[PDB]
Amino acid sequence: NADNYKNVINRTGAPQYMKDYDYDDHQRFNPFFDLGAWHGHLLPDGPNTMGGFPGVALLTEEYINFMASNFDRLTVWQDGKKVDFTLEAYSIPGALVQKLTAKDVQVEMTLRFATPRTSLLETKITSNKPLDLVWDGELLEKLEAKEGKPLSDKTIAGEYPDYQRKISATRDGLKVTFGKVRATWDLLTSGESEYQVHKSLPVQTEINGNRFTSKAHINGSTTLYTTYSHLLTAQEVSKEQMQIRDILARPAFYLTASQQRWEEYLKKGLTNPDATPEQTRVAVKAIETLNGNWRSPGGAVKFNTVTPSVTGRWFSGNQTWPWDTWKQAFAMAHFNPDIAKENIRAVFSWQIQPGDSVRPQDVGFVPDLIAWNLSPERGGDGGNWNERNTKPSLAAWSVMEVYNVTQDKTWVAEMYPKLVAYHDWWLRNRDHNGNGVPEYGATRDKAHNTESGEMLFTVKKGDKEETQSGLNNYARVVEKGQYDSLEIPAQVAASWESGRDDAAVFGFIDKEQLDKYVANGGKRSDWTVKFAENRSQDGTLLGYSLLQESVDQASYMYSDNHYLAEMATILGKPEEAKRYRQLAQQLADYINTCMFDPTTQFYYDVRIEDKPLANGCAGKPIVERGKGPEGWSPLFNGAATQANADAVVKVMLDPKEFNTFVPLGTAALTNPAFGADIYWRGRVWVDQFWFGLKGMERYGYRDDALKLADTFFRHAKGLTADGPIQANYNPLTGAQQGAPNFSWSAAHLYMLYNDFFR
Ligand SMILES: OC[C@H]1O[C@@H](O[C@H]2[C@H](O)[C@@H](O)[C@@H](O)O[C@@H]2CO)[C@H](O)[C@@H](O)[C@H]1O
Ligand SMILES: OC[C@H]1O[C@@H](O)[C@H](O)[C@@H](O)[C@@H]1O
Ligand SMILES: [Ca+2]
Ligand SMILES: [Mg+2]
């Protein structure tokens, strides 16, 4: 029952600005979203907002933007006396509720979602006498603030002259229309988008500029219904009208469908009732978060999907990442498999096909970031769409988990060839030395190379920045050492392809950290990253590889290969299943032979050296760049031998390595490029944390994993409070950072609830 989990996240707030941002530019409030809808609602915070759900949050294609503070707020009049109500407002999973109580009149307002575009408000009025109902609303004026404090005195209309917001009135309520705004990083509307209000009774709505007042008279106790719809195109507007009429014709049907759908999420999802109440509350927060971040089909993304955070400054709209998705779907398989499936379909719906106009050399490539708007390269105007890189291979894992739950063979038959094609891309475009062990790298892309296909790089000495191109020129520069630093877009993308932006093993290290490394006897050239172009025998530039095979991706391709094998078996494709088992086995041999360092007792990426080693390995483990979470990837993925795993686990548990106040961060404390404030060189992310716990368990160390899980639960800050879930933690102090309502934190906090919280 949803009513046991009230106010799991604080969803109160009265937005005063379109961008009512917190310190890191995320909307500092947490609206309720559901059914994949494109608008959200907040609870009133007091007297000023009661009678309404303030802060209509709109998802304007790729961003979250508030529309109004008070919109369709009820005040009730009884024979010319304004009823002074007492307020009680709360959220539960799948609803907002507010109760207005006075002596003679009471109102109970219940807000759920009814469709992918429409929320449904039940306004249940109890009264002896007839009443006069007044609803009011007012569009926001001010643009931007941080922590409530204005960033400028700019207005919404000033900044977006074509936004030109107008309220109109309909034969059963009212609508806000919006002009076309193509503000790449802020606000994207089609010019046909609307916010529609329809009601089950006639109302008399008057409009004065950017506010309205609607009136109605009722003869006494009655239940009213209101729909709120953010409709983003004309096609959506037309298509939704019959939905709205069915909703208002049979509102009970939709309330019950929301009630039931949510009972089902909690029933399916809450499988560890022995968890502490606060742990259980964390799982519910996670479920609320993941479902809040679910977006129904929109623009270029023709499937339901889940973004990393609906309130996130760069994560909102339907902006979708692959490895985020794999993790999200894996978790969501257990309580909302329908959308788990969709999320995965959404990512693969933009897998590169033969004959692709932009990058035919990348067949099977899965884009890093898809969203409502295609990039200019594909005829859209989206600034977020990204095909510089993909993310790591956790896709078959995610698909198999959905299959584990649903036992739906049609799912496996649907996903198998997409997974095959993805596997095939890695081996074709990310395996420079042809040894079947992939590298991270970078696509042919305007961020990475010149039109003529020469790799870009920038040399910096003092205040001189010197932009250049060509791998051979890059090689000569690197050897000579006549620079302070280098910025290499293909290096950035390779690190983005691992998902661990700026991680040490990809050669990312601060000036002062590198100096100290060299002073301690290290060679500066130990951190130099090398690259090679991957060309088809016909000359075609397929992309760039770091001259480096990464242990995480090898390990992920390992398990991915096993899941392909199981799917092949399920689909009666015994030869293909054979091939994938043998490929897996080869990878495991290479992981253990090449990537394991028995001396430091850890796994590392290897260099592709100029000559392969005598054992066939492309190069030595890159021990000198330090230890990271990629070191237990072989364990999470089952590639490791027991002895290698035993060794890795001692390192994981070591306080001078990864056994920190919040343990298992993204670089060990001994990593020369460590920083507690650095996302992927020290901060603790819940995915990597959980992958380590799973790795440990798989090789017999579940008891130790439980204690790390307990330590994490006691130390990771804000976990038992009512704040939104964020992305990562300071390993030393446990302070939270990163986007609020962060999906894969929710996914993995949920899996921890399921797998490791006791
Ligand atoms: O754009 C592709 C990359 O996006 C990065 O994510 C955010 C980044 O965290 C944020 O600070 C800002 O730069 O916008 C980006 C989203 O467009 C990912 O971190 C990176 O791995 C790529 O996916
Ligand atoms: O959640 C979306 C993205 O957020 C970034 O901060 C992380 O570095 C990426 O690995 C992730 O894919
Ligand atoms: Ca290789
Ligand atoms: Mg019990």
Query: How many domains is the chain partitioned into structurally?
Result: 4
**Inter-residue contact 482 to 584 (CB < 8 Å):** no
Domain that holds residue 257: 233-271
Cα 306 to ligand 2 centroid, rounded to whole Å: 13
Q: Identify whether residues 296 and 171 lie together within a single domain.
A: no
Pocket of ligand 1 contains residue 323 by CB under 6 Å:
no
**Ligand 1 pocket member 141 (CB < 6 A):** no
321 C-beta closer than 6 A to ligand 2: yes
Mutate which of 185, 325, 496 for ligand 1 pocket (most atoms within 8 A of beta carbon) = 496
Q: What is the domain-level CATH number for residue 295?
A: 1.50.10.10
Write the CB contacts of 618 (distance below 8 Å, at least 6 apart in sequence).
Answer: 433, 435, 437, 549, 594, 606, 607, 608, 609, 612
Q: How many residues does the chain have?
A: 758
Mention every residue, 6+ apart, whose C-beta is less than 8 A from residue 440.
Answer: 389, 430, 494, 495, 497, 498, 506, 545, 546, 548, 550, 553
Question: Are 692 and 548 within one domain?
Answer: yes
Alpha carbon of residue 95 to chain centroid: 22
Burial of 48 (C-beta count, 10 Å sphere; 0-12/13-18/19+): exposed
Q: Which amino acid appears at position 408 of this protein?
A: D
Q: Which atom of ligand 2 is nearest to the CA of 744?
A: 1
Q: 280 and 410: one domain?
A: yes
Q: Are residues 51 and 116 in the same domain?
A: yes
Last residue of a domain, one of 181, 213, 232: 232
Ligand nearest to the CA of 439: 3
Same domain, 470 and 350: no
592-626 CB burial, b ≥16 within 10 A, e <16: bebbbbeebbbbbbbbbeeeeeeeebbbebbeebb
Nearest CA to ligand 1 atom 19: 501
Under 8 Å between Cβ of 84 and 75: no
**Is the minimum distance from the CB of 49 to ligand 1 under 6 angstroms?**
no
- Same domain membership, residue 731 and residue 589: yes
482 and 494 fall within a common domain:
no
**Integer Cα distance of 539 and 134 in angstroms:** 72
| CA 449/CA 432 separation, integer angstroms | 17
Q: How far apart (Å, rounded) are the C-alpha atoms in residues 707 and 719? A: 17
45 CB near ligand 2 (under 6 Å): no
Q: Is the domain of 159 the same as that of 287?
A: no
The Cα–Cα gap between 214 and 52 comes to 13
Same structural domain, 77 and 196: yes
The CATH number that applies at residue 463 is: 3.30.1390.40
- Taken in order 421, 423, 426, 432, the sign of the CA dihedral is negative
Nearest listed ligand to the Cα of residue 326: 2
| Same domain? 674 vs 657 | yes
The ligand 2 atom nearest the CA atom of 738? 6
Is there a single domain that holds both residue 9 and residue 153? Answer: yes
**What is the C-alpha to C-alpha distance for residues 307 and 315, in angstroms, rounded to an integer?**
6
CA dihedral sign of residues 719, 722, 726, 731 = negative
Pocket perturbation via mutation, ligand 1, pick of 25, 307, 321, 324 by most ligand atoms within 8 A of CB: 321
User: Which residue's CA is minimally distant from atom 11 of ligand 2?
Assistant: 499
Alpha-carbon span 347 to 396, nearest angstrom: 13
Give the closest residue (by CA) to ligand 1 atom 8: 314
End-of-domain residue from the set 232, 259, 285:
232
Which of 250, 271, 292 is the last residue before a domain boundary?
271
CATH number at residue 246: 1.10.287.100
Q: If you measure from the C-alpha of residue 381 to the centroid of ligand 1, how many angstroms do you get, rounded to a whole number? A: 18
How many CB atoms neighbour CB 129 within 10 A? Answer: 12
* Contact call for residues 405 and 337 (beta carbons, < 8 A): yes
- What CATH number did the domain enclosing 131 receive? 2.70.98.50
Atom of ligand 2 nearest to the CA of 501: 8
How far apart are the CA of 690 and the centre of ligand 4, in A? Answer: 24
**Do 466 and 613 belong to one domain?**
no
Of 260, 327, 255, whose CA–CA distance to 289 is shortest?
327
**Distance in Å, CA 310 to ligand 2 centroid:** 14
Judged by its nearest atom, the ligand closest to the C-alpha of residue 276 is 4
Residues preceding discontinuities in the chain at C–N > 2.5 Å?
Answer: none
Write down the residue that tokens 């398989």 correspond to. Answer: 333
